[PDB]
Structure formats: C-alpha cells, structure tokens
Design an enzyme around this catalytic site. Structure first.
Site, short mmCIF file in Angstrom:
data_model
loop_
_atom_site.label_atom_id
_atom_site.label_comp_id
_atom_site.label_asym_id
_atom_site.label_seq_id
_atom_site.Cartn_x
_atom_site.Cartn_y
_atom_site.Cartn_z
N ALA A 9 0.83 -1.20 0.00
CA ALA A 9 0.00 0.00 0.00
C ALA A 9 0.87 1.25 0.00
CB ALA A 9 -0.92 0.00 1.21
N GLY A 53 0.69 -5.82 0.55
CA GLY A 53 -0.33 -6.00 -0.46
C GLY A 53 0.25 -6.51 -1.77
N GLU A 82 0.60 -10.23 -1.37
CA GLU A 82 -0.78 -10.71 -1.27
C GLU A 82 -1.39 -10.78 -2.67
OE1 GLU A 82 -2.38 -9.15 3.09
OE2 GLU A 82 -1.96 -7.70 1.49
N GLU A 90 3.92 -6.28 7.87
CA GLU A 90 2.92 -5.53 8.63
C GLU A 90 3.07 -5.47 10.15
OE1 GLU A 90 2.37 -7.20 5.95
OE2 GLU A 90 1.01 -6.08 4.64
#
EC number: 4.2.1.18
Lengths: 265, 266, 266, 266, 256, 266
Positions: free
Chosen positions: C68, C113, C116, C136
C-alpha cells in the site's frame, strides 16, 4: 482374471493385493474392469482378516492408462457423464476402504490411473514410471476425483500447474512435488515399487487392527471438518480402542517385555 | 510441584516466557500431576498481559516428553482412561489456543503426547538427533492428544497416515524433511541447541506490535478452519482491532522519524 | 493512465494477456487510484472470452509492488483506514477469482499488499534475487489484503506464522524452498527473467481446450472451499460442461490421427 | 437368529422387500445380535438389483421397537457404551442411505432407538394407537441413534426440542399433527393397519422406472446436504443418468402406443 | 430502574428462571437500558449451572415487546443480544401474552419454544418503514415457518394473532387468554415444569447437539451427536437413570 | 410471438407486472420457443426499476403449465435432451432469482416443469380444483427443473419423496394441506380465482419500501443457503443498505406527520 485379488500368506498374511491385469488394453478402466474393481472393493470393505491393501499392476511398464479411449469413442454423449461418474464413484469407494491402502506405481499412470492412485493412502513409484493428469489436452478435465484429490495432496498451486499444463512427470519429479512418498530405482523384474509397497505393508501388520482402522477413520473424517469437531472425532475413535482385548494385550506384552500378539478385538 | 518451571526471562529476553518440563524420573511423561500443573500454567499465561512469546521445552537433557505415563496408565480402570486422555487432549488444545506465538524446543525424545504437545505450538525446532513420533498403534491405541488431527494438518494426510500406521520414530533431520519441524540444528555439548534456537527466533518476534501479533495469530488459526470467504471476513475483523491502537500510530511516527518503533501493546 | 498497462500479446503469445503495474515514482504501491484501474482491468478480463492465461508483472525493474502507498496511508484517518484496506482485499480476491490461469512474475520487491496480490494468482515465479514478505507486524498491524488467509493455505500454518510473526523478507531462493513460489530462476541483464519464465509457462497452457481449462480452475477453486464429497459433485458438474463441446470430439479425433488438436473453445 | 425376517414379496408385490423385527421377549430391543443381523440385511439389500421398495415393520403385535436393550446397557461398563451406541447410530445411518424408497410401518411402541430407526426411513406411517417418542433425557442421556439430528430436520427445531426436552411420548394421532408421520391409521383386529397402509404405498411405487426412483432419492438426499446451486447440479447429474436408459425410451414408446409402461430397471 | 425482573422461582418450580420485561411506559420497547440489562442478565444465566429452564415473559398485560451511522451499530447490538439468547444453554420458552413486534418477535424467535394467547398480536412490519428486520428475523423466521410464509409475512408486513401464528407454525401452543392476561405464561410454566425432571447435563448437550447439528451437514451433525452423548456417559445421573428405571421410581438427578 | 404476454398493470395496480402464459394448443407446455421468450422476459424484468411485484399466471382456463412438450421431446436426440432440460432448469432458476416478490397463480393443471416453475416463485396460490404434481418417475425420468431440490425445501424431505416416488397429483386443497401452496380458494365462473388472489396479495406489497423489499428477499434467499452465523451477517449488510435511503427517512417522516408513507425506491 483382468483383476486379480491375492490374499497373501506367511509373513505377508493380512496383506491383500489388487492387481490390474489387462495388458491388451493398457490396464484401462473398461466397463468390465470397473465392474470387477467395484466388486473387489465392496467385498474387501467388509473383510475381517484384511489388514492392508496394495493396488498394483501385473503388467510391466504400465499401472493404469486411464479411460478406455476406444470405448469413449463409441460412447454417445449421453452415455459419457454416467460412465465417468461410475468411475469417480468406484475410486471414491477405494478412498473409503477401512484399512491402509498403498498404490504401487511401476508403470504409466494417466488420468483415471493416477486418480485411482490418489485414492490410496500412500503412493510409491519407480523413478522411471510416468504419471499425470493430461485431460485438458483432450479438452476435458480430470473426472475421477483428480480436480479434488491432487490439490488436497500437493497444494492448489502445484495441482493447478499440472492440470493446466497437462504435464507428465516421472517418479523423481513426482517425488519432488510430494505426489508420491517414495521413489525407487526400477529393478530388472520391473516391480520395484511393488517391492517397496510390500515392505511398507509388512511394517503396518504388527499394529493393533482396531486401532489402525479407527486411526484412518479419525484422520479421514477429521480432515473434512473443523479442528474442534475433529478432536471430538478423535475422542470417539480413541474410545473404540479402550474396551478391546488388544489394548490389554498391548499392556500385558509390555509387562512381560515381549512382542504384542494382536487379534483385532 | 517443581516438575514444571515457568521462567519470565529478562533483559535481552524481556517478554519471553519459558515453560520447562522437569520430570527426569518420569521422562517428562504426562502424569496427572503434570497435566494439572501445565493446565494451571497455561491458564495463567492466557491472562498475562506482558508475555510476547512462549517457549515450551525440557530441563532434562535427552528428553522432551515421552508422552503417556504408562505405569500410571496400567493402574487406570477402563472407565478412567477415556476421561483422562480427553483431559490431556483438552490441555494440549488450550496450549494451541495460547494468544501469543509459541515455540516447541525439541532437544530430546518427543513421543505420543509429547509430539502432540509440540504440534500444539505454532513453531517447532529440534536437534538433528532428537527423536519423535506417534507410536500409539503399536499399543493397539491411537494418538489421543490431537495427533490424528494436527499431524495431517501439519504434514499432509499421506505422510501423517504413514507415520501413524507404521508407528515410526523419526530423527530431527527426517522430521525437517517431511516438514514436521521448521528448523533442525546439530546438538551442542550442553544439549540445548534447539532451546537456544528457540530463544533466537523468539527474540525475533519481540519487536513487533503485541496487539497485531495477537490478532494475526487469531486470524491465521481461525481462518484455517473455515472457507476463504469466511476467513477473509475474519481477517478484516482482526485488522480492525489494530486500527485504533496507539501502537499503529507509533509505527507511522517511527517510520516518519526514521527510528526503531517502541510498541507498548496498546 | 500509464499506471497499469494491459497488453493482449500477439501471434506466438495469442491468448496471453499481460497486466503490468507501472508506478516507479511510488514503488508500484497500491494507491487509491491504482487499485481502481486494476479492478477495472480485472472486471473486463473476467468477461473476456479470448483470454487463456493472465500474467501479472511489473514494468519497473527491481520492483514488483511495495504494498500500500505508505505516503497516503499516513494521511488516512482511523475511520478511512478499514474501508480502504477492505477495498484492496476485495480487488485482490477478484484477481483470485479470475476465470483463467493467472501467473505472478516477480522480478523485484513484493511486500505486503504486493505479495498478497501474487498470492491471489494461481502460480508464482520469481528471480533468485527477488525480495518478498509480509512485514505488517513491524508496523503494529497485520496483512490486510488476504495474506493471513492465503499465506497459510499456500505454505502451511507453521511457516506462514513464522514469516508473519517475524516480518521476515525472503529472496527467491528461500521462497522456493518453503514453497511460496513454484519456479525460481537466476535474474538476467534485463531484469525480466521471471516475466520470461511466466510467458514460457503460459504458452504451455495455450494448446489446451479453453472450456476445459476454465471449468477445471472452477472445479479446483470451489472444490477446495468445501468438503470432498461436495467437491466430487462440483467436479461432476464441471466435467459435464465439456461433454457437449466440439472441442471434446476434436480431442478424440486428434488423438486418433496422431496430430495436435485445434481447439476453438466450444 | 430368526429375530430379523427378510421377506422378498411376490405376485403384485414382487420388488417389495419386508424387514421384520421378531424379538418379542426383548420388545424388539436393539441388541448386539439384532444390530448385527439388521446390518447384514441392509448391506445385502443395498446391492440387490431387484429391490424397488423396502418396508421396515414389526411382526410382534403392539410393539415396533423399544430401543436400547436396557438388560444389556446395565451389563456393559462405561467404556463399552460409547462404541456400542455408535454402532447403532451407524447401522441406522446405513438404513437412511438405502438406495430405494423405505417405509417404516409403526403398529406399536417406538421409543428411542426405535423411533430413530423410523426417522431413518423416507416415510413413516403409524396406527393412531401406536406410541412413539425419544425419552432419553428422562434417563439422563440423549437420543444416540441420530435422533438429535433427524427429528429437527423432520419436524423443525422448535418441535423437536420440545419432544426431546420433555421426553414426551405421543400417539399416532399427535405424531401426525406435528408431521412426525405422513399417514395415521385406525388400528385393526390383526394389529397391522400401519403395515397394510405401508404395503399399499409401496405398491404405488412399484410401477415407476427403477433407475429413476433411485436417482430421484439420491438427488433429494444429497441435494438437501448442500446449497441449492450445488443441489441443482446434482439434479442434472442424476437426470443425466436416466437419459441413456431403455426405460426412458419405453416410457415414450408406451405413451405413443398409449398403454401401461413396462420398466426393466435399465 | 428495575425494567427487567429476574425471578428465580422455587419449590415446585425450582430450576426455572423468569425474565420479565416491565416498561409499560415504553411498551417494553428495546431501549438502551433494557438491552444492557437484558444482556447482563443473559450473561449471568449463560454461566449459571443451577438453572434448568428459562422463561421470557412480559409483566405488562396486553404487551410482550414492541419494536425498538448510529443506526447500524445499535441495530447490531440488539441482534447480538438476541443471538446470545438463542445460545442460552438450557431450554428457553417465550410466553407471548401481548404484542410482539419487530425486535419483539425476533426476541421470541430466539427462544426454543413459543406459546401465545390466541388474542396476542405479532409480526415483522419493518418493510412499511422502508427497512428490513434487523434482529435476525430475516434468518430465524424462514427457518421456523419456511421461506414462502416467512417472505409473505415480511413482504406484506402483516400482523397475526395467536390463532393464526399457530396455524403457520410460528408458535407451538396457543390458548385463550384468561382474566389475568397471563395464560401464555401459565402454559410456559406448565411446559417448563415438564422439563425439570430430566437430567441437567443431558438436557444441555441435547440442546447443543440440536443447535449445532442443524448448522452443518448431517454426517457432521452425527459426529456432534456422538460427542454430546459422550458427555452423559461418565455422569452419576446416567447411572441414577438406570437405577430409577429398575426400582420403578422417579429419578433424582443432580446434574453430574 | 404472443405465446407469453407481459402486462405492466397501471392505476390501482401500478407496480405490478404479469407474465401470462398463453399456449392452449400445447397446454402451456415448456416448448423451446416458450422458454426463450420466458428467459427473455425474465432477463428484462431483472433490469426494470419500476417493478415491485411479479405475478406469473396462465391466460388459458383450466391450465397453468403441463410441463414438458412430449411431442417436441419425442423428436429430441439423446444428446439434445440433457442440454435442453438444463436450459429449462436454468431459466426456472432465473425466475427464482427475480429481485422482486413473485407469486404463482395456479388456476389449472401444473405438472412437472409447470409445478417447478411455480416452486421458483416466492409465493404460490391455487384454486381448490387446480391439479399439480411431479409425475416424472412414471416416465422413467426425474423432475429436471429444480423439483428434486425445491420441493423438499418447500414441504420437507418425507412429503417430497412420497410425491415424487408415487408420482401422484394433488388438487389445491391437498396442496394447501401439505404446505405446497400458501392460499387455496374456490374457483370462480371466469376460472381466475387464483389470479385474483395473487393480485390482492400483490397490491398488499405495493405500499412497502421498494429498496427494503428487494434486500429483504436477498437476505432471506441467500440467508437460507448458508449457516445462521453467515446468514445473520448477510442480514446486517442488507439492513445497512436501507439506512442511507430517502425512503427510510420518509418512513420516519410519514410516521412523524402521521401520514401514509410515499416511497419511490431510493
């Protein structure tokens, strides 16, 4: 005689071997072979003495080539669905056999052939053996449970790659992706995988018969439900062993520091 | 009662708690006394708000936990066995539900209930010479401490079945090969290479946000027991819990001022 | 916008559609605007009947996707966080549900992300020097784009927890050893070795019956979200879709004539 | 011994098989031997090509099945209760999975295991003077033969909970009122009213295409275990099984020649 | 404010606990406090091991319970407490002697059994307000009376009396109201007393087996039943049960 | 083709759309041309923003829908049967997914596909003299339009099995008795009593908030195919969609000014 059922004796007593014997049709899954395989499995499903079942080929270089493409060619479209479901159902019956099952892959295992092996608890093969699900290359998909079992055996990523590419792997490669548990260099007689399977089966024989069955039950059913429910299932399966003579014999043999002699009760 | 020691380490290991099994005479076997003690210790840690990682290990060199205390088992009536084994299964399960990262340090024999106790931890590390397995079927019984459930989920059905069917004992190196453990190490003269490795991995966890670590473990354990659509909803809920925390702000602040984050678990 | 290019390869690679993230100025971070176009390309590709394989790659050397856009996140309020993170999670899930084979070509850094996103693809390939991980927790939060669910499902609970708990970053070689990726190859002077292996792998999918390939992915994906018995019924429905196709017959004909099939997707 | 009679009917009843419980001395209780015989009869019938409908009844006036053999339940130790009750649960489930239409003819008392057995059949018919119920909670246990699962699915949770919580015994008239049975009959001088109605019902089934009857049941039973979308796919697969049958053609042939169909079960 | 009375009956009804809503000044509407107390009282019982049955009734004649970025959160609070009621460990009976609307009917739908005076009224009229049932009614109503009837009631936002609610299976017992206006409650107690003699441990795992089994496939439900049954095997009450049957006398269970 | 008339009532019935089947020469049988029109009309209605309730009925006295067209089926190749039946099953399923309340008005024969099409409607009303049932098994086939799935879900497994097994036909009175229809009434001189009741029921739905009605049906249909926890989650989302509508406030406002609500579906 296209399907041979041998109830071994001597040191192998308790071991049963299902040998596919259709060298003419590359051990393909014909309407008749499926018929007999189903009868054999149904009969064994409730066989007392059986302690371990091995599925192998008695034809060198071939385990099972899968669907009888000759027949499929004659089959009208309306007959294809039902037949493939018959195959899917018999392979699922193999998956639900009460005792430990081992597939000995010493030859080619394609389509239904590999799916059948996927229905066994453990797979062993020669490094030279060839296996894979090539259905998408024929514009169909694995229909003997492969889209379901391959992924549960080696993960979705690898399963998808093999199904999407319709790739054929050799024993060594199959071992590398965990499709099989043991890979063996083929011998002169061509039964190296079978030999390994027989030894593994003999390694199962001395264990408590009731315990083996309920253990398989707990693992198979346990994996189909959430963990908490799986634990309750384990409790229920463990309870089955408590009131057996074998459990007592296990303890007695321990006190007398002697090897256990289980009867299956 | 000193059969189970709980040490809240300090300094470089501040945050790490260690549960040490100490029943050399009983080969760290799961006696009724030991399960109660472990159950008592587990319930205390579920409330401790300072712990950031828990390590389970043995104080006795060469032994982790030989599983069931058979001599005590031989004196149990048929009607006592079930309830007692369930007691073991439930305590191992409470360990599996510990709120923080758990690590099993296997420097010795881990059989039956011993390996099952190890499977309840998030991570397993063992000495290459450590021995482990579920031999229950050789005694006409089956793994009763969650082993028929956790082994297959950890190494797959095919390998779990072969191991339980054969009642085979594996060494650290073979366990690493089948994926039963994550780290294997050559044993040291003190006989605690695995423990030392567990401490090293644990210290690697200490710096992260306590709340995030907790909800991350919750998200992973719960989500693995439901379908993906449900698991994703669980993730969103777990993620929501870190949003209004002081530690998340500290993370952005630290990143801004280019400095190590110092979280408080709030 | 040049933030996300959608190339529908030609001739030799007809059927292969490449999706390339292009935002070097922001490390390809999943910005508010970027996911918007991505979601747009996905919704389109979804209904596209000519595509046979989708490859996700980066047009920025040394970078896949850094996660992100941290610069925008610091500006986000507590109440705008959850909704935004959920949007990303949803679009990534949309990628996981693409009708055809999807391949993630990782020739750079894949974080949060970003990884992911790659976990949402059927197959992942990376250069030995490529870097990836979910960090994270070092920021007091947890993976929020499906990582707490897809990572454990891909590499198992134990390895997934260790990576998330330690917020460890891995290179291609290690990723390959834990099964995070299926193919690893040494990078080349162009820094697109992953993209190249992906293309080669994609071409390997092209010769297959288009309808069969779609219902096969459907069978696998949906079957793994339910129990095996239901899974078997799903396989049956999918298989039934290939029975009345012209491609099925062409398959039997081509096998008989000992020549390559020429499927038309019907 | 002769405690379980398996009668293959003839004439205008050929295709109909009757399983009759005959243990007057034990009120047709589910003893170790009756379960063994019940189990072998059911397993045999499952692979019997000729059977078109099966009726379960009692050949003992005023008694269907009193359930658990309390003379035995008092004899066996705790550790033996679980496995034995599970055996009974399993054989009753085997009955529920018989491939052809099954009818329970209740002309007498059906308690606990007795009622549960009746719940395993597709249809239940009973004399208005017959008594039935799951009174387990009055004995400090719960319905162990599948009753906690089958009763709620048959008459709803609110009603099932009330019957199990209160351990109430109902007569045929009240059973009909709550949907526990499909038809209630005034008992006759021979005490076989329910059975007579069961025979007439079975005769209504006989003329239909055998393969179709079997797949219809399969579609209904399995379709109700999955979501509707999946159930519809199962319906398609079941319907597909009737297409390539000689009976389907005979159905059409009979329609043109405007006459009564004559099915062969193929 | 004693908006929620928690009567712990004794003697003849020892084991029965009554939760009476008393807020005629609000028609028993679901207010902040009602929900907080109701919730607090459920948490208390939820862990109480002496209770054998719980009856939810209204102490305000003619009324059972009417209806109820801020909206959503508070609607989910009611839904959550109602669901908590659905999860009480012992049998629960809803005695409807008055009006049951919206959250009120959804409250009754969270109980195991429902009884109501043939004159009492109830229904889910949220649609007339351009909104839908938000206390689980859209889930529990279909599951109780079936999809078709559930939809007709919600689509029409129709109100029904006890006699009608009974014919559609919304309630299990209907009866004429008495001069005191507590005929339903009277029936609820009579029913609750019918449960009292049963084994406490068996009653609880029986509700578990039923509630949990209905949320999964039958094969799984069977495994759940097996586990629940197992809990009763090692209990003293199970042996007392066999003992009582042999001596042809009433069982005296202790919940162990 | 006028085989299917779509009427958008006005004035006192504004908001109601009627799909009347008019194929007397074929007994409103599901011909290939009829389903295409039906499919066309249904696809169109799912886009309509003015529709608030859909009624399905027959424009031919004494007939609702005789199901399959045996004349067109007798000329059907074995390979055509499956796909065709599946096409019917799919179109009946789309009827079931109509966003607005649907009502089936049965004033005549409803056999096979006819009854199944009726089962796809939320509510069914019929005349006392209307006949209906699934007689497939008398033709050696099974209900192929969703009947094996929708019947058991509508009236329970035991009753559905008896009806499908016996392949008997029930009149409106008996259909009401087994829960197959919600309202039964005596036929009138025009033979449209069912249609009249359907209209009276439809006008009873008109006054409610359009958006709420839509989300109510979504919550109930989708909610009944998943577990309760998930279903309650679905309800929370459907509810949230009515919170920011102009209608929700109009309801409170209308209740404020003590006047009847005037919603516009926004």
């Amino acid at each position: 005689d296209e399907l041979r059922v041998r109830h071994l004796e001597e040191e192998n007593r308790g071991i049963v071997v299902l040998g596919i014997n259709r060298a003419y049709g590359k051990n393909s899954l014909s309407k008749n072979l499926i018929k007999m395989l189903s009868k054999a499995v149904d009969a064994l499903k409730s066989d007392k003495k059986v302690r371990t079942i091995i599925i192998r080929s008695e034809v060198p270089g071939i385990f099972c080539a899968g669907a009888d493409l000759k027949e499929r060619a004659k089959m009208s479209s309306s007959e294809v669905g039902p037949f493939v479901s018959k195959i899917r159902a018999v392979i699922n019956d193999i998956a639900n056999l009460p005792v430990p099952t081992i597939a000995a892959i010493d030859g080619l295992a394609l389509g239904g052939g590999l799916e059948l092996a996927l229905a066994c608890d453990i797979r062993v093969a020669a490094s030279s053996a060839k296996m894979g699900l090539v259905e998408t290359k024929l514009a169909i998909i694995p229909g003997g449970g492969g889209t379901q079992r391959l992924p549960r055996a080696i993960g979705m990523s690898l399963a998808k790659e093999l199904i999407f590419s319709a790739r054929v792997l050799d024993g060594k490669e199959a071992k590398a992706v965990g499709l099989i548990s043991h890979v063996l260099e083929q011998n002169q007689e061509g039964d190296a995988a079978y030999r390994k399977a027989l030894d593994l089966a003999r390694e199962f024989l001395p264990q408590g018969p009731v315990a083996m069955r309920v253990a398989k039950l707990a693992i198979n059913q346990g994996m189909e439900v959430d963990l908490v429910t799986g634990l309750a299932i384990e409790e229920a399966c463990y309870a089955q062993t408590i009131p057996t003579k074998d459990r007592l014999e296990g303890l007695l043999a321990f006190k007398e520091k002697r090897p256990p002699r289980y009867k299956g009760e």
